[PDB]
Structure formats: C-alpha cells, structure tokens
Structure 1
Amino acid sequence: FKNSTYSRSSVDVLYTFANCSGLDLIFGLNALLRTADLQWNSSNAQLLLDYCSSKGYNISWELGNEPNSFLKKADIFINGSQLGEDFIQLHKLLRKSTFKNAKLYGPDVGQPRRKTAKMLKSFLKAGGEVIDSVTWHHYYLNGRTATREDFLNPDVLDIFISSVQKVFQVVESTRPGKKVWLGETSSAYGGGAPLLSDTFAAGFMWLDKLGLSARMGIEVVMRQVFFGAGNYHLVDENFDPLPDYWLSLLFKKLVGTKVLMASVQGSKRRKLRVYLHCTNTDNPRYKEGDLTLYAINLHNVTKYLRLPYPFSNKQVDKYLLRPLGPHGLLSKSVQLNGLTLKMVDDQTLPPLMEKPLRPGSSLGLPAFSYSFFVIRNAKVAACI
C-alpha cells in the first residue's frame, strides 16, 4: 500500500452521499502520520477538521485501521499505550473545534488472535476514557479459499461466539460498560469469496452474525461493504441490490432494538439457529408487545418450529427468503414468500409483503433457508 491524497471534492462527495441518504458518516483518520518520537502528527487531520468545520459537516471520527498489523503494512510498530495517547490528542483537537460533541470510536483492531488482546487492553487502559465505543473487526473466511460448504457450516458460524467473548474479556477488564461495535465485518477477507459473498448463501453468515451480535451485547454492526469492488458488497457494480441487501432491509423493517432470547430444545442444535427481538412497531401492521423471531435452517430438510406457551395459538406473519433459480444458494436474486424482490424503479423500493399463517400451525422452514416470523398480539410487557 502506498500513500494517496484526496480532495475537498472527495470529502464533499462522501458527505453528500451520507447526508442525502440519511446516514451518519464516520471518517477514519490516518494514524501512520508520525513525528520523530513516533507520536501521531495531527497536522493533516487539523487541515481536514478545519475544512469540515468551515462547511458545517456533522461528522464522527476514527483513528487508524487494524493497528496490530501496522508493522506488516508499513514497518512502523505503534504499541497500544501510544495509540491511546494519540486518541487523547485527537479527542483534544475535536473538543477545541466545532466538532466539540462529535463522537470518537476506536481502535478498529482485528479479531482476537494469539496476542491481539495486549494491544486492545493497553489501548483501552491508555485512551479508553475518550472513545464513545470500542470498534473491532470480524471475518469468518479467506475469500481465496472459502467454499460453499464453509458458508453453510454451523461450526464456522459458531467460531464468532468465541471472538465476541474474548473481546468482552478485554473490555470488561479495562472499560466495563463501554459500548462494543463491530466497526468492519463480513463473510470473507481479500474482498470476499467470488459467487459466495454476493449470493443468497452469504445470508446465513450475515443474519447469524446480526443474531449473535444483538444477543451477546454488540450495539452496532458495520457491514463491509454497502458498495465497492469487494464481492461482499450489498449492492453490485450496476447499482443492483444483492440478496444481503434485501435481507438487511427486511431485518430493519421487522426487528426492534429490544433483544430477547430463543433456543431450540435438544442435546445439540447448531443447524437450527433462532433469535428473538421485540417487533419494530413503526410498521402499522404490528403493535406494542409483538415479537419478531428469526431462524436459519442449515439442515438439508424442512424443519417445523413449535412456539412455546403462551404463543402457540397466535396469528404469525411469515417473511421467508429463498433464492430465485436456477443457481439455488449461488443465486444473486431472492424471493420473499415466493415473490422476487426487485426495485419498482430507481427511486422506489417494493413493499415487503408478509404471508399470514393459520393460527396454531408449526412454523415451516425449508432446507438452507432463513425466515422472520412476527408473533402478532404477543402482548410481551418487556416490549412495553
């Protein structure tokens, strides 16, 4: 990797995209600009903050990407303590600016390996007080070697649980109560796995990651990428949405902020994965107390879910996602309850239409499929 410059025009393009889209821009600053004593040289960042200030740009900040690999990337080793001091410097800059109540996140470390905890721990000790969230990164696979079986493998999905537990071990030891974010996450590194990271098959790892993240106390999950060269893009090079886009839209429609818990009875149950939230009641179809279950079936046969008492006679809306043929799990097209999901036009998303089930029916979930189920009139007081 070699240095590049970017323009006011570049910043304007990115800010406008975010602002017109209703998204909150987080901008990563260059942490490899160093003084002789290997302090962070903040002077380029001061240029950028002044320009953003001058334009009234409402922006949040990070400093550095994956510091534990700085020696590999640039032959510069920055320990966690120094990075903490750098974040303190950046915090002071932000507080002396129009960005005085702008947010700061870091340090965007990779997932826990033999000794990546030392950097995150010494970083949180040193600079933990000035960050609004702890950001780390997670990938399951190498895009070069990943197989279709890896994408469908419950043992691959489950390794994520230990990554999360190891991160929370470091944070609880140094900054208990600090919000933990996945600041960069996807299926496969090296730009994704061709014909896997951009297909219906990607949805197992994406929905399971969202389920486990919410269940285990991760507050924000940042999908690599919305759009770009990587096969793990949610939108392709023709600006067409891939199955993970539709999955992400359906998740946002149905899933509320209050996380609950579902589990399957039986000795091992790794292939039937289940998650439970309060329903998103912005939807006028649903009301206070409604539940959203979501479920992944990685068995090669249909499974039938029985809701526990007292929800076994409730009206349930099914939102079942399956690939549009002929490429099955390797399809870049997806059907919701047997209707293909396509933009109505370049300005217009389709409705996402439920399939009501007859009250008292088991929830049918076909082989290698994922579904949302809204339990109507659930009247769960925890959901207010």
Structure 2
Amino acid sequence: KFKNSTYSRSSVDVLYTFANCSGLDLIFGLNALLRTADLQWNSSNAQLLLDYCSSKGYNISWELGNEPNSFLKKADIFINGSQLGEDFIQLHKLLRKSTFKNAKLYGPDVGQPRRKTAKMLKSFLKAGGEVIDSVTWHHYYLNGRTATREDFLNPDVLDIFISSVQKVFQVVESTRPGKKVWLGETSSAYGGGAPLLSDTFAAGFMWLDKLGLSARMGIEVVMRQVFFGAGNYHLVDENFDPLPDYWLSLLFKKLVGTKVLMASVQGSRKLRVYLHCTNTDNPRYKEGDLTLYAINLHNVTKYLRLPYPFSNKQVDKYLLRPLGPHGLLSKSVQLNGLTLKMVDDQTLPPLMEKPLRPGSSLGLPAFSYSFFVIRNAKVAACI
C-alpha cells in the first residue's frame, strides 16, 4: 500500500521551526528500510540529513524505524531484533561523530507487546540496549474501524492497557534494568481513530486514564498520536480548532506535577482516581499542594470525600462537561460551566477554578472527569 517519497530541506525547516518557536523538543524518525546487500542498514541518506541539520544548527533527538514488527507485512522485508540493535549501534556512531555528539537516541517504536513484538523487543534490547536513552513502544486500545461508543466508556476496555504496560516492563527488566520506558506513539484507536468518537468528549476517558495509569505504573513520557493531522484522533482539527482532548491536555499541563502519588477508593472500576503533587510552575498554587484527578464512568453523580489531614482544605474544582446538544459525542467542552474557546489566534483563555466550600464533598457527575487542587496541603514529599 505504501510507496517511497522524498522530502526537502524546506520541509525539515518547516518542521524544526514549528517545534522550535513552539517551545517543543523535536524527535525525528529516520528510515530503517534502506538496506544493503546483506540486509544491513544503509546509513548514507541519514548522513545527508544528519549533516544538513548540524550545519543549520538544529538541536534534534533521533529515532530509527517505526513499528519494525510490521515491516514484513508492509514492505515484504523481515528485520529481526538483533540486526535492528546493530543498526542502532551504527546510527549511534554517526551521532557521536557529529556537531551534536550528545544527541539523544530513542527506539525501537515497536507495537504493543503481543507474542511476536515481545521477542523482537527483547532481542532488540539485548543488542541495541546500550545506546538507546529510552525504550519507545506504541499502544492503541481498539480498531477505529470497529470501535463503539460503549467501548470508549467501558472500564474493562480501559483495564487492558494495564497488562500491556506490565508486559513491556517484564521484557525491559529482564534485559536492561532501569532503562527509561516511553510511550512513543499512542491514542484511543488505530487506523486513524474511531470516526465520530476519537475527536469528541468521549475520547477523554481513554486519554486521561492512559495518563494516570502511565504515570502510576512508571512510564516517564507519553506521546499523543496526533497533535494535528488527517486522523480524527487529532488534538486539533483541520480548521486549526482545538477538540475536547486539547483542552483536557492543557488542563493537565498546568495542574498536574512530576511527582506521582497514589489515590484509591474504599471498595474498588468505574470510579478511577489519580494523585500527583501540583505543578509548581502554576502561579496560583504553592509547594506542597496536591492535584487529584478523577474519572466517573457510572451513570450517576458520585461524591468523593478527602481523608485527614485534607478534609477541611480549600479545594479548587476544574470539571469538564460537553457543550450540548450532542452530549459525549460533542466536539465542544465547558470548564465549570464556561465553554473553552481561544480568545483570538494568539491567546488561550484563562482556565478559571471553581473554589469549593472547605470541608465539602467533591461532586463528579455521570460520565465526566475533573481535576481538584488541594490548597495548602503541606505534603512534605511535594516540597
């Protein structure tokens, strides 16, 4: 189905400019299906790109290949994990002899660990583990072609991610202990996303749950397929308008910190809760505050009580609900009753908290998600 394509120095410059001026760090995936006479990686094209990027002064991290597991199916070429390790070794040598000798390298961007992908990842790590700074794998829950609205609301669907994560860590810890593990490319459903589902309020249960579990289970970095593009799992649509998941993401950026804690409900599935220290770059909040976030997949409102010593603290609510009339299939979302929309093309809106009565229960309507910030919580681990 897929054929070779070339791309220009212009394209490189657009991509880097976009990253650079947006305050983002760029990871460029190089073509791994350029081979030699003995099925060895032919590095000459990358060398061209490597050289060009050094000359222009671009600070770029690298990957080599994407889903090598599907190479046989998609290009009639099989590369085993050993070989691919060797190929990563060869690329590493090229980076260390470049202007950015410390340039970061990540791989191998294998699919989620079924039996075939586990063997490939293991042998890849035994051979190439030495030179990768992070292990990248990808995850999707469902086939976008067949995925239902019920699937997106279903806790048993959410739960499968957990075993995927355990299987990656079981391979990594058996071959390169303590290597950082990243989700390299991930979202709701594959094949471009589920139509009328992956671009809606309903998509947010899978997105926020993925984040909470990933943080809790030790994933360091999660990369969301896709910021912008043809697939309806995009955060931003073809008109450059943001979808519910963008607003969910932005809320998460601002409120949720790097130190991961744990929260759980007495009598444990449809009420799912996560706890981190509050993001200390948030100017409203202070060292020691907590950020709780919670998903409610029941069909009624639920009411959460905070434990001692946090019962009578000031809580700030940040609750997300679709702007009707399309309900969970809406492409619009409100924060505490206020619709979220760009002020102008240059200006994101404020995200106004709703302060709750100290000592009050935490309301979480049916099919919703919310953040809650617990102010002056004075949690020593957060300082």
TM-score, shorter chain, exceeding 0.5? yes
Which whole-Å deviations, capped at 9, do the CAs of 1:141-183 have from their partners, x for residues lacking one? Answer: 1011000000000000000000000000000001111000000
Could you list the per-position Cα deviations for residues 87-134 of structure 1 after superposition, in whole angstroms to 9, with x for gaps in the alignment? 000000000001211100000000011221110000000000100000
Q: Which runs of 5+ in 1 are unaligned?
A: none
* Mapped partners of 1:89, 1:227: distance in 2: 32
The DSSP-based 3-state class of the residue aligned with 2:38 is coil
Distance 2:112 2:280 in 1: 34
CA distance in 2, matches of 1:260, 1:333: 31
Q: Distance in 1 between matches of 2:72 and 2:247?
A: 39
1:56 is displaced (CA, Å) by 0.4
Q: Work out whether residues 27 and 60 of structure 2, in 8 Å CA contact, stay in contact via their aligned partners in 1.
A: yes
- Is the Cα contact below 8 Å between 2:141 and 2:187 reproduced in 1? yes
Report the CA distance between 1:277 and its aligned residue: 0.3
Q: Distance in 1 between matches of 2:282 and 2:85?
A: 43
Runs of 4+ in structure 1 over 2 Å off? none
TM-aligned CA deviation for residue 369 of structure 1? 0.2
Match of 1:312 in 2: 311
Say which is worse superposed, 282-291 or 220-229, in terms of deviation. Answer: 282-291
Secondary structure in 2 matching 1:14:
helix
> Deviation per CA, 1:310-348, whole angstroms, max 9, x where unpaired?
111111000000000010000000000000000000000
Give 3-state SS (helix, strand or coil) of 1:320's partner. strand
Alpha-carbon distance in 2 for matches of 1:350, 1:160: 33
User: Mean alpha-carbon deviation: is it higher for 216-225 or for 113-122?
Assistant: 113-122
How far apart in 1 are the matches of 2:115 and 2:123? Answer: 16
Instruction: Give, in angstroms, the shift of residue 284 of structure 1.
Output: 2.0
Aligned to 2:275: 276
What's the counterpart of residue 176 of structure 1?
Answer: 177
Q: What is the rounded CA distance, in whole Å, between the counterparts of 2:127 and 2:277 in structure 1?
A: 38
**Following the alignment from structure 2 to structure 1, what is the Cα–Cα distance between the partners of residues 57 and 347?**
30
Mapped partners of 1:63, 1:229: distance in 2: 23
Deviations 1:62-85 (A, max 9, x none): 000001111001111100000000
Task: Structure 2 unaligned segments of length 5 or more: list them.
Answer: none
In the other structure, the counterpart of 2:189 is: 188
Residues 1-384 of structure 1: pairs in structure 2 closer than 5 A: 1-267=2-268, 270-384=269-383
How many Å apart are 1:59 and its aligned residue? 0.4
Per-residue deviation, residues 214-270 of structure 1 (Å, max 9, x unmatched): 000000000000000000000000000000000000000100000000011105xx0
Q: 1:138, CA displacement in angstroms?
A: 0.2
Identical positions, percent: 100
Number of residues of Structure 1 aligned to a counterpart in Structure 2? 382
What is the distance in 2 between the residues matched to 1:256 and 1:296? Answer: 18
Does the 8 Å contact 2:69/2:116 carry over to 1? no
Deviation at 1:309, TM superposition (A): 1.1
Counterpart-to-counterpart distance in 2, 1:175 and 1:17: 35
Partner SS, residue 116 of structure 1? helix
What is the DSSP-based 3-state SS (H/G/I as helix, E as strand, rest coil) of the residue aligned with 1:201? helix
TM-score calculated relative to the size of structure 2: 0.99
- Matched position secondary structure for 2:304: strand
Question: Matches of 1:190 and 1:369 in 2, distance apart?
Answer: 26
CA separation in 1, counterparts of 2:359 and 2:74?
58
Question: Displacement, 1:308?
Answer: 1.1
Measure how far apart 1:281 and its partner are: 1.9
Q: Is the CA contact 2:113–2:167 (under 8 Å) kept in the aligned structure 1?
A: yes
Please give the alpha-carbon distance, in whole angstroms, between the structure 1 residues aligned to 2:215 and 2:348: 26
Hey, what's the Cα distance between the residues in 2 that align with 1:343 and 1:174? 47
- For residues 208 and 308 of structure 1, the distance between their equivalents in structure 2, rounded to whole angstroms, comes to 23
Secondary structure of the residue aligned to 2:284 is coil
Q: Contact 2:145/2:191 (CA < 8 Å) preserved in 1?
A: yes
Displacement of 1:31:
0.3
Take 1:319 and 1:173, find their aligned partners in 2: how far apart are those partners?
Answer: 41
Higher mean Cα deviation, 112-121 or 356-365?
Answer: 112-121
Report the CA distance between 1:46 and its aligned residue.
Answer: 0.1
Distance 2:247 2:214 in 1: 19
- CA RMSD across the alignment: 0.5
Deviation per residue, 1:274-308 (Å, 9 max, x gap): 00000012122111100000000000000000111
Distance in 1 (CA, whole Å) between partners of 2:237 and 2:100 is: 34
Query: Equivalent residue of 2:106, what SS?
Result: strand
CA contact (8 A) 2:162 2:213 kept: yes
Moved more, 112-121 or 82-91: 112-121
Question: What do residues 341-372 of structure 1 show as CA deviations (whole Å, max 9, x unaligned)?
Answer: 00000000000000000001110000000000
TM-score where L is the length of structure 1: 0.99
